[PDB]
Structure 1
Amino acid sequence: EKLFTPLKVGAVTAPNRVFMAPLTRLRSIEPGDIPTPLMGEYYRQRASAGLIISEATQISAQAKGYAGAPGLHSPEQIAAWKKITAGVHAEDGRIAVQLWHTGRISHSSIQPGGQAPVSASALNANTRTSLRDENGNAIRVDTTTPRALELDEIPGIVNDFRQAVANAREAGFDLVELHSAHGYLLHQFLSPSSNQRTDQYGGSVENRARLVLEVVDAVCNEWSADRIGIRVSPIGTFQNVDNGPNEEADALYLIEELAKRGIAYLHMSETDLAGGKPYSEAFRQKVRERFHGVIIGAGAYTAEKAEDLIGKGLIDAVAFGRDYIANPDLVARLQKKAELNPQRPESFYGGGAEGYTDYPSL
């Protein structure tokens, strides 16, 4: 089956098209937002993936929106991630780091100085984030109303993405994935629903896409375009962030701009976990004719759907999320048509080994 055939993805070659989606698990050490040996073990268990895309990782301390999410900005974080990439490479895997700034999906209590988080504009996300209680357990909390970034703060954001990509190179990641989806900072600028700015970073689609394209250019210049992927969720609503009244045209504009940079891949998150409308094959064809790198699809895929769309030439790979949580050897299971392990969603976020490294292989 095409699912188990190789694929060139920028600077690396995936041996199969079964990718591990980025999956926030909120198990990092605080203080310091530091990856752990347990996280290293979890990723090593999944190293047969065509590509592992890490959990979303902070570009800076300001980027933090969830207690337990790791960073890639401090020396201690870099040191810990080096162990994780080494372990994946020891098993002949490939790993990309997903890099985010959460923007307004955050809480003042985990921001520098205990201050309001930042965004394109000053309106509340009307979403929940996850903090930790006094015993270290994950709890759901309402997001804090953000402050609009000043114009003079925007270059610093771009620089933080640049620096985090430099750090990713040092840490031995194979690729980086920019988190431009799911209502986080880059998507907050992209969407008219979250961006009411009247300067060069809001209004028109060109203005709304300006920040993400500055970030893409900065990180391509820092490392290489064949090391850079981007995740978008440009059709539908994700965590209360829609894509405005011209979502298809605006998506195609962004994709045409991304193509000019010659980046490694475009990762399309197709639906929110709470549901959304399917992509049409016509839209997939419009994306395909505008982007000349790898296209990854995600969002409640089955192997059957993946094989269908890869066979139709519309996408190149599929990222599985929850099936990868529950099946470290998902590749082997799909190749052999074996049953999958049951999921335990109660242990997706926070905690320890249970519901993390205790899902068995065949």
Structure 2
Amino acid sequence: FPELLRPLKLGRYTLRNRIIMAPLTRCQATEDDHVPRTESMLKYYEDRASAGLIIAEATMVQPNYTGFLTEPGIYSDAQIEEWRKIVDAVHKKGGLIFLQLIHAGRAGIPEKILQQDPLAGRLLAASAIPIKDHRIPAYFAASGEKETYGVPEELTDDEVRDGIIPLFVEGAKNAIFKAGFDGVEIHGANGYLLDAFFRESSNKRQSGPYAGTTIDTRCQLIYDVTKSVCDAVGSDRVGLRISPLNGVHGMIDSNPEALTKHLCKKIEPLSLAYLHYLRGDMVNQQIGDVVAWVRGSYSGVKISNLRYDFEEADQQIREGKVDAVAFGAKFIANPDLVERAQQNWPLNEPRPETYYTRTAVGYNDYPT
């Protein structure tokens, strides 16, 4: 896999290879303080530092606005302190690491958020449309009871512009200037806040710069947040992730192609370190050639993801369709994935049953 193992210029950095570790929520942080549990999390990331680039798991930018109960945050000094240790360990191995910045939006856990600053103690989204497809996963629920997502409040353009955006900015500054991350990745995918403004199913705003009436206005929040973050920490230290076809939380847009292409053209002027996207849906309902769409509408670094294997990854990079591929499940199960690629070693099979144990089990128990 010569193309997959070839170095790559990304932002102000140079990846040793194009085997990227996708952001992976593992819930290895303290419950209410959302402080990275360094003991386990450090070894986890250090063990995978041979990755061309590691994209750290979705990390909270709004205090207490938790979507996964015990995910990391990057808004407090306590969180910054531990992250720094983790980032330092990755860098000592010669690796690179970006931190994915997230806001759960309507996917926030009610029992935790509502039990709490005009943005505090509230569920926020583009529109008062609750997730209805499924319950809150038991490994994310605040109690043993069957919990369900709530009806969020419609964010005013003012709260968005002056409340939400500044949080992403401080979070990026904290991550890069304090924790020492090489960069950050704006989480504009998988049904969370930004994706909720992005796709039509969850954005029914009648007016404002973030209206759900046009593809351009729906792309505005992703752009504004990304632009503001770029001005604050430099665009060559900023990446963005999207998932135009991911149906999670009932997310759906009728024009995934035009939406994706339009967003590419819109962020093009930002000169981002990269654009990262899921090329499909977890199930075979929503389909489309996202690789093709981004390819013909974006001139920057393209990082694709979803059900890739070394060969397919190597082949698309060879054909110039993508510049790099981020692996999710394979990195969970293979700390030394890169090495296994260099020699075509077989890969450990992942075990979804233990993705969120919060213990060493299914976290640091995968052999090298």
TM-score bin, normalised by smaller chain = over 0.9
Give the 3-state SS of the residue equivalent to 2:173 in structure 1. helix
Superposed, 1:124-163 pairs within 5 Å as: 124-126=130-132, 127-130=134-137, 141-155=147-161, 156-163=163-170
Which piece of structure 1 moves more, 351-360 or 220-229?
351-360
Partner of 1:28: 29
Is the contact made by 1:138 and 1:350 (CA closer than 8 Å) also made in structure 2?
no
1:119-161, Cα deviation, whole Å (9 max, x unpaired)? 0011111244346699x99987321221111232112101111
Cα offset, 1:31, TM superposition: 2.4
1:307 to 1:35, Cα distance in 2 relative to 1, 3 A: same
Give the 3-state SS of the residue equivalent to 1:177 in structure 2. strand
Cα offset, 1:351, TM superposition: 2.2
TM-score (norm 1): 0.93
**Aligned-partner Cα distance in 2 for 1:250–1:16:** 30
**Aligned-partner Cα distance in 1 for 2:47–2:324:** 20
Report percent identity of matched pairs. Answer: 38
Partner of 2:180: 172
Superposed, 1:343-354 pairs within 5 Å as: 343-354=350-361
Partner of residue 92 from structure 1, selected from 87, 91, 94: 94
Root-mean-square deviation over aligned CA pairs: 2.0
**Aligned-partner Cα distance in 1 for 2:67–2:97:** 23
2:211 counterpart of 1:209: no
1:280-328, Cα deviation, whole Å (9 max, x unpaired)? 3xx6344223222211111111111101111110001111111100100
1:61 to 1:140, Cα distance in 2 relative to 1, 3 A: farther
Partner of residue 267 from structure 1, selected from 264, 269, 276: 276
**Aligned-partner Cα distance in 2 for 1:329–1:109:** 39
**Aligned-partner Cα distance in 2 for 1:34–1:236:** 29
Cα offset, 1:165, TM superposition: 0.6
Superposed, 1:330-345 pairs within 5 Å as: 330-345=337-352
Equivalent position amino acid for 2:310 in 1: A
1:161 to 1:153, Cα distance in 2 relative to 1, 3 A: same
Partner of residue 196 from structure 2, selected from 188, 192, 206: 188
Partner of residue 315 from structure 1, selected from 294, 299, 322: 322
Give the 3-state SS of the residue equivalent to 2:171 in structure 1. helix
1:270 to 1:239, Cα distance in 2 relative to 1, 3 A: farther
Is the contact made by 1:162 and 1:218 (CA closer than 8 Å) also made in structure 2?
yes
Partner of 1:66: 68
Superposed, 1:271-310 pairs within 5 Å as: 271-276=280-285, 279-280=288-289, 284-310=291-317
Which piece of structure 1 moves more, 56-65 or 283-292?
283-292
Equivalent position amino acid for 2:90 in 1: V
1:146-186, Cα deviation, whole Å (9 max, x unpaired)? 11112321121011111101101111111110000001000
Give the 3-state SS of the residue equivalent to 2:250 in structure 1. coil
Aligned length in residues: 357
1:79-134, Cα deviation, whole Å (9 max, x unpaired)? 11101100100111111100110100122112164444110011111244346699
List alignment gaps of at least 5 residues for structure 2. Answer: none
**Aligned-partner Cα distance in 1 for 2:145–2:21:** 26
Cα offset, 1:78, TM superposition: 0.6
Is the contact made by 1:20 and 1:324 (CA closer than 8 Å) also made in structure 2?
yes
2:53 counterpart of 1:51: yes
Give the 3-state SS of the residue equivalent to 1:356 in structure 2. coil
Partner of 2:18: 17
1:132 to 1:305, Cα distance in 2 relative to 1, 3 A: closer
**Aligned-partner Cα distance in 2 for 1:27–1:137:** 18
1:262 to 1:140, Cα distance in 2 relative to 1, 3 A: farther
Is the contact made by 2:69 and 2:140 (CA closer than 8 Å) also made in structure 1?
no
Is the contact made by 1:3 and 1:16 (CA closer than 8 Å) also made in structure 2?
yes
Give the 3-state SS of the residue equivalent to 1:2 in structure 2. coil
Give the 3-state SS of the residue equivalent to 2:239 in structure 1. strand
2:240 counterpart of 1:230: yes
Is the contact made by 1:104 and 1:119 (CA closer than 8 Å) also made in structure 2?
yes
**Aligned-partner Cα distance in 1 for 2:113–2:214:** 30
Is the contact made by 1:235 and 1:248 (CA closer than 8 Å) also made in structure 2?
no
**Aligned-partner Cα distance in 2 for 1:139–1:332:** 43
2:365 counterpart of 1:358: yes
**Aligned-partner Cα distance in 2 for 1:12–1:130:** 37
**Aligned-partner Cα distance in 2 for 1:88–1:153:** 36
TM-score (norm 2): 0.92
Cα offset, 1:272, TM superposition: 3.2
Is the contact made by 2:125 and 2:196 (CA closer than 8 Å) also made in structure 1?
yes
**Aligned-partner Cα distance in 2 for 1:343–1:223:** 36
Is the contact made by 2:168 and 2:225 (CA closer than 8 Å) also made in structure 1?
yes
Cα offset, 1:279, TM superposition: 4.1
List alignment gaps of at least 5 residues for structure 1. Answer: none
Cα offset, 1:235, TM superposition: 3.3
